[PDB]
Design an enzyme around this catalytic site. Sequence first.
Site, mmCIF file in Angstrom:
data_model
loop_
_atom_site.group_PDB
_atom_site.id
_atom_site.type_symbol
_atom_site.label_atom_id
_atom_site.label_comp_id
_atom_site.label_asym_id
_atom_site.label_seq_id
_atom_site.Cartn_x
_atom_site.Cartn_y
_atom_site.Cartn_z
ATOM 1 N N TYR A 1 1.074 -1.154 -0.252
ATOM 2 C CA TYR A 1 0.176 0.306 -0.293
ATOM 3 C C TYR A 1 1.133 1.198 0.059
ATOM 4 C CZ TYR A 1 -4.353 -2.345 1.378
ATOM 5 O OH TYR A 1 -5.861 -3.363 0.843
ATOM 6 N N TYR B 1 -13.887 0.644 -3.007
ATOM 7 C CA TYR B 1 -12.969 0.034 -2.160
ATOM 8 C C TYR B 1 -12.205 -0.508 -3.516
ATOM 9 C CZ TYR B 1 -8.787 -1.005 0.723
ATOM 10 O OH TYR B 1 -7.629 -1.470 1.055
ATOM 11 N N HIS B 2 -11.239 -0.446 -4.103
ATOM 12 C CA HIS B 2 -10.529 -1.405 -5.040
ATOM 13 C C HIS B 2 -11.090 -2.090 -6.257
ATOM 14 C CE1 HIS B 2 -9.278 -4.725 -1.499
ATOM 15 N NE2 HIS B 2 -8.043 -4.299 -1.202
ATOM 16 N N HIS C 1 -5.918 1.133 -5.774
ATOM 17 C CA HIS C 1 -6.576 2.040 -4.524
ATOM 18 C C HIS C 1 -6.314 3.603 -4.602
ATOM 19 C CE1 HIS C 1 -5.249 -2.296 -3.480
ATOM 20 N NE2 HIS C 1 -6.256 -1.586 -1.668
HETATM 21 CU CU LIG Z 1 -6.812 -3.030 -0.903
#
Ligand SMILES: [Cu+2]
EC number: 1.1.3.9
Length: 639
Positions: free
Chosen positions: A272, A495-496, A581
């Site tokens: 991340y 998200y994603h 992300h």
């Molecule tokens: Cu993730």
Amino acid sequence: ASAPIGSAIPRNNWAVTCDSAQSGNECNKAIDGNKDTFWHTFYGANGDPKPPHTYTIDMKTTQNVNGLSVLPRQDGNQNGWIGRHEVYLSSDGTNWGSPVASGSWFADSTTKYSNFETRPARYVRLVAITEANGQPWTSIAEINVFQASSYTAPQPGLGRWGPTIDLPIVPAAAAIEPTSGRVLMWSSYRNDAFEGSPGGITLTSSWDPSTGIVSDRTVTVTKHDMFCPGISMDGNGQIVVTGGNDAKKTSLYDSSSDSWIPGPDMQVARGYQSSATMSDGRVFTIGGSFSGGVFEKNGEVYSPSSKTWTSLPNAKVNPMLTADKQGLYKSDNHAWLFGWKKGSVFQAGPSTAMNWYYTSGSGDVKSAGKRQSNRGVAPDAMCGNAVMYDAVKGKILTFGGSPDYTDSDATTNAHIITLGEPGTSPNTVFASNGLYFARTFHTSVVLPDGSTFITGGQRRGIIFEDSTPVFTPEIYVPEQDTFYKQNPNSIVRAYHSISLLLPDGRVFNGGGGLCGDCTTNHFDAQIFTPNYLYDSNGNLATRPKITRTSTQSVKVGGRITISTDSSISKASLIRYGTATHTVNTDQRRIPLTLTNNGGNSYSFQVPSDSGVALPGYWMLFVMNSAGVPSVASTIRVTQ
Ligand SMILES: [Cu+2]
Ligand SMILES: [Ca+2]
């Protein structure tokens, strides 16, 4: 596991037609409501005629159709699973138009969905172009069609959504392959799951915009499960994918040979993290506590020419942490990094505090002031977006995000940061009156005309819950300092999820989910066609063409000369993008100042500073007086 955007249309009065049906496996066994009966095309004594096979539904009245779903046979036999496929809608049963969805479904027995913008229709047709394992047959235990609560026609002038691209994975990361034009995507060791990975494997899929083909490929040669990685395109034209589920690995995607090559392990294990390509073609990364452990992970730098990562411990991560409720585990994630002049990397957030990062010697970091305006100091904006829409004037537009990664209300904050020399605090102002819709987990791309397209997200970030979704995209137009809402779509992209600029000037927006047996995996994507591609009757406008370029590899500072089939008013260069992300540190735009040679021949100079014109692959677009862009020509920019 997935879900449909709609509610199932009752099937009591449907008439269905199939190209062939084995007796016992009649066409209507796919709509009898029994999961243990299926339609199945001819085999055995009837011969084994090969796909395409076709299932046609007359629903008798017009419905506001927004998906269909196919339950494969459930008897443990794989014969007739559908691979490549297309979905058509029709109001007369005879004229079918263009598919409203197409692509490929993963080879297993779970229910498959095609989700697409609502369209009124009475007839639905599913064509099974291939069987999932290459065999002759098609079978289907239950097929449903879904409708929305209503239909509203898109408004003229605000772009259009569709078609849907059906995929065999959730594309939580993606990249354009610049030499082929394909969209490259990947999930993790599984098509929709990342937890419990044994490491060593990434499922990938690619969509080719010009054939519409979706293929896939399981990547184990770099021994890297690439879910949750940094991504940068380096000056050697290779995409460097770092860390994530195998926190130390580097994989290199080479668009020319279309292949993956092992790179050297990072010095520090990360997940991340953001990485950013530098003015010398190297790649910088910092932070990343999602995997490899939670502790201070200061910067390091990758050299494509010597293939090493070297640690830069004095490019310190501390100054860029947010106050995430979850601490360092979240607080050094997804920095808004931009390579800039002389090896420096600017960090624009998500933390309030912005910073210069330096990569000479063992590195350095220097405060660049707080992101703020006359409205106050901007709070932490984890998974807000930042986009450099004019590299030549150092303009970055930032917007959305929330103080914590998750369980946290997003905002409509937006700023314009103007970079000058490394080490000086840039001017930051509020952008216009902020976003129309507070959002986090949204995605964005700069478009050929310098405007920035912003889409998806949710008002309160709650990962994997498709709650408080934002369906209406916005475009920021810098010359007017104004946002404009565009036509909404119907698929949650939270998200994603990812977006990228395609070479033909449309936006590809997909993913969302990747959470195992959660019900919010979106195994698809859709295209957004901006208004600049339509004339004032809402048909596709005629696009100028670049008929010649004098070179397609140029050094920063060098000129390129082009010919077009018609006069152009503007041109820009847009660096190819990568995405996961909310992070895309690869795209950026350079507006071009054209010399008119006459006769529809033009020149321009690539900026001589390679912290502006970052080395790598760029798209050249030219726009006619009507604002219509060409498709891109690919230019490799070197230093
Ligand atoms: Cu993730
Ligand atoms: Ca059945």
